[PDB]
Amino acid sequence: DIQMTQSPSSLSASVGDTVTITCQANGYLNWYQQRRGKAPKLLIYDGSKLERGVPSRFSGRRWGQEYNLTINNLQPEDIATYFCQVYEFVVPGTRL
Amino acid sequence: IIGDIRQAHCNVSKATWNETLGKVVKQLRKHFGNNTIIRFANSSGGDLE
């Protein structure tokens, strides 16, 4: 069985800070970035492993059943929708 | 073809198949819930193999 929780439903923080979004799930977990009307793009997979092509301002870590996505040095082109993805279960992510 | 035109087939025992499938559904409930409904459907598609 797969259980999902997404507590940061909406946040509109400014640029230059360090924001973090969390979601609690068991199993493998990937993070995706989705714009408006565009295809989603994989940022990190397996909780902490980085994908080639993603800038180094993205990082993540896990502790038990809590996955975090650290966003430092925000950019004017880094405002999109982010959601965590278990195999066949995708929660509606939040927008910045 | 010397004889009748017939179709190839296979036979399994219906009493043995329900006894064998009754044990797989008992062991499948260890990885899932105790009161779940386990169904068996046929193939969904692909090539003939």
């Epitope: 990937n30 994989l42 994908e51 | 598609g45």
Partner: nanobody, 121 residues
Framework: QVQLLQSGAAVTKPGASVRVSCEAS????????IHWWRQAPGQGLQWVGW????????????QFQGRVSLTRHASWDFDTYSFYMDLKALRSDDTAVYFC????????????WGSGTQVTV
Amino acid sequence: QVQLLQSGAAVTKPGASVRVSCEASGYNIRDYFIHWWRQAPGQGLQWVGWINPKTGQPNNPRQFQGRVSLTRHASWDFDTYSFYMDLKALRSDDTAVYFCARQRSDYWDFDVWGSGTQVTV
């Protein structure tokens, strides 16, 4: 080089049948699954199913059995494929955009996606 081409949009009536194409060109197709995703306008993503490009065996959830039929087609030289997705009877709430993902490893890494095909009823 690894790209997944996407077909154009299509407008149909409630009760017709659609077909969304997906062409994978620049990698080894037979060693990676191809999934399908769908998102409604205003909601998140929703899983449609995968298809084994080597064998052809599809998989679909309980809410999609009997309607969607995943079918692939390979060329003679096996360098490019054509993944199809035919819907039997579209309802009124099927107005959405369909994607064409690609599973990379056992962690279900969908690194490359499709351009998207939005269909309405």
